[PDB]
Amino acid sequence: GSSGSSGVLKQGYMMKKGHRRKNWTERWFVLKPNIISYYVSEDLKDKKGDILLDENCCVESLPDKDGKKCLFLVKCFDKTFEISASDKKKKQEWIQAIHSTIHLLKLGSSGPSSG
């Protein structure tokens, strides 16, 4: 079958919510197997940020607001990421992939040395 795959799992144009201002702006997204980056466009030249995926991090479905449909947001340790989908296909197809992507990390969880 397939053994040893590195790269992005999902990619498409999504609308990210700029915490700074209550507005939506189309932006490229790169759903990684162990992370989630988002570039201004589908060029991957000007990175904006990275969402360290982990058992802790998860995705949830949001209601309808500001005249939006199929909204969703990701809740991480302390950081957050609010994204908006176009149709039910993307919204789901995304949340599903994101959720699963994390589960994989749950399988192998190592206890970090604190103190």
Curated annotation (Swiss-Prot):
Domain PH, chain residue ranges per copy: 8-103
Localization in the cell: Cytoplasm; Cell membrane; Nucleus; Cell projection, Lamellipodium
Tissue and organ expression note: Expressed only in mature B-cells including those associated with mucosa-associated tissue and bronchus-associated tissue. Widely expressed. Abundant in spleen, and fairly abundant in kidney, lung and liver. Also found in monocytes and macrophages.
PTM notes: Tyrosine-phosphorylated.
Domain notes: The PH domain is essential for phosphatidylinositol 3,4,5-trisphosphate binding.
Subunit structure: The SWAP complex consists of NPM1, NCL, PARP1 and SWAP70.
Stated role: Phosphatidylinositol 3,4,5-trisphosphate-dependent guanine nucleotide exchange factor (GEF) which, independently of RAS, transduces signals from tyrosine kinase receptors to RAC. It also mediates signaling of membrane ruffling. Regulates the actin cytoskeleton as an effector or adapter protein in response to agonist stimulated phosphatidylinositol (3,4)-bisphosphate production and cell protrusion.
Protein name: Switch-associated protein 70
Protein species of origin: Homo sapiens
Included stretch of the parent chain: 211 to 312 of 585
